Structure 1
Amino acid sequence: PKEPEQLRKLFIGGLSFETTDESLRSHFEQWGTLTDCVVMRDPNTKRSRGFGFVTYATVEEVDAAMNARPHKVDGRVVEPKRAVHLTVKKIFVGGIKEDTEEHHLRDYFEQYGKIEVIEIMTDRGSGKKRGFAFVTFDDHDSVDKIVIQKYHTVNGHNCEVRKAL
């Protein structure tokens, strides 16, 4: 049972105009089997549009490629992103109620990426927990992995997680 193809793709921006299907493939095959690899070109001039995409056989291979950033492809640092692009480093986490603490959020979310800020929201008047939080990571891929999951279970609660700002 293969993961949906959409979840196995990486959109690569910032390509050198000299990158080809073949050179993009040779680079990204270092992190997995590529079932597809395309440089986007103008239909008349054939000149590169400066971006393309690759499709891996599995999501773990996407992860491996993302974990190997920064990628210098044909002499230029490129910008790979997965499909979810609203590129942000912060998430809203809702439904955590009053008993969820910082360490619950950190122990779970730290496995998606490096956390810089955890903000458990409290009432401006009473100080009581409001039941939601924001987590800021050092990089957008953490957020992208998070928001494509169907479910997040933290401190026994099924949470609603969305990109923030």
Structure 2
Amino acid sequence: PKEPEQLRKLFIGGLSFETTDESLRSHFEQWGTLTDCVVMRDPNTKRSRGFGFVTYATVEEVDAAMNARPHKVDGRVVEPKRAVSLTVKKIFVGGIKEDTEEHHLRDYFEQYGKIEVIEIMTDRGSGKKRGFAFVTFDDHDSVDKIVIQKYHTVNGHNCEVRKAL
């Protein structure tokens, strides 16, 4: 059945004040079926608040829209982000124990986004692996996709993954 609506929504910040529900829809419909599309406006002046939301029919359509950034809507580059579950590019990965290596984390996480840093944590005194790591991506959407999954399995371990600093 249908993925939860919260996971199919994109907040679109930085809109041109001239963007309307119709022009926002016409833009974002290029990447999927939109079940909802709203420009936030002042209740008295009707002047745009400079942000809005679009809701796609599926998560894969959200991915397609995010993969097509940068989006220029009505002449202005906007800022799409998945709805809340801050905006960061780094994750903590725990529960990897002592047998998990860089390539294990790379091979798994590279399908969420472009990796810039993998840091497998070792003990300051002994050099032994401590069983957690940090992965830094080039962009926040990778992290946003990662942290909404219920499960992450890497090197046979069920991992705890959260946003880092």
Regarding TM over 0.5, the answer is yes
2:24 paired residue number = 24
Question: Which runs of 5 or more structure 2 residues have no equivalent in the other structure?
Answer: none
In structure 2, distance between residues paired with 1:85 and 1:7: 9
Residue range with higher mean Cα deviation, 25-34 or 84-93: 84-93
CA contact (8 A) 2:96 2:157 kept: yes
CA contact (8 A) 2:117 2:135 kept: yes
Task: Classify the secondary structure of the residue corresponding to 1:141.
Answer: helix
Give the drift of 1:23.
Answer: 0.1
In structure 1, distance between residues paired with 2:88 and 2:81: 12
Give the drift of 1:84.
Answer: 3.2
1:146 paired residue number = 146
> 1:34-84 CA distances to partner (integer Å, 9 max, x unpaired)?
000000000000000000000000000000000000000000000000023
**Count of aligned pairs:** 165
In structure 2, distance between residues paired with 1:45 and 1:14: 19
> 1:112-142 CA distances to partner (integer Å, 9 max, x unpaired)?
0000000000000000000000000000000
TM score, norm. by length of structure 1: 0.99
In structure 1, distance between residues paired with 2:84 and 2:21: 24
Give the drift of 1:85.
Answer: 8.1
CA contact (8 A) 2:147 2:162 kept: yes
TM score, norm. by length of structure 2: 0.99
In structure 2, distance between residues paired with 1:53 and 1:67: 17
